[PDB]
Amino acid sequence: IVGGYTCAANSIPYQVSLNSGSHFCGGSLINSQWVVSAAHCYKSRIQVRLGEHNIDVLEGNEQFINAAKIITHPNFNGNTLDNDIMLIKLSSPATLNSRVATVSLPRSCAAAGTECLISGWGNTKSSGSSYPSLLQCLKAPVLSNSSCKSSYPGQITGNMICVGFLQGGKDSCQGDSGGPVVCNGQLQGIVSWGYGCAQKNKPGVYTKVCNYVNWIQQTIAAN
């Protein structure tokens, strides 16, 4: 997260870190056994870390649970990143408590202008690299479908939304993939891609979660 702030303790109880030796993507806890993340974060072995704030220090609130099922969207396209969403079923249910809680799936798509909260342990620099120990947060609005498509001609499908600032300076970045965009308390986006990070007229592009609520429910119901 470039241009954000260190999240408070107790904030973002639904955030998870996907770890395969090192943190490489985030995700969101949507019920005690299932995590949603980006399909390009797929790896055959994933440990999910819940209740994390400082990813470099064991603070004593963490739950580390291995992924049992790892299901990418049937129509995920690795080249275009269309349908970039994956479900992970934990090998054991998470203990929901103070520090670990779930986020709701959207009841409707978010309108342009809705303010959202984006979070992650990704790069905090647009030029260079600085990877934070503490979870970073960013408040940013959903951009109109027209501003998003004009920022990235011929690359935005109906399954993608732009969230951010056309002016740049504040954006998600490498290491934030798969993480949450929560607007009005509902999960509306998944960190997916962009050109660089925090560049002028290149806002982050996120998977539009309100298109997949029935696929998520059916997949959870079947597994």
Partner: peptide, 28 residues
């Protein structure tokens, strides 16, 4: 260039996804 926001180390550009390039040992 379309570059997924996954953290990934690399030694060559070919190690990275989509249009990401290897910028000093990491894809971006």
């Amino acid at each position: 260039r379309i570059c997924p926001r996954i953290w990934m180390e690399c030694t060559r550009d070919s190690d990275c996804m989509a249009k990401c390039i290897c910028v000093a040992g990491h894809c971006g």
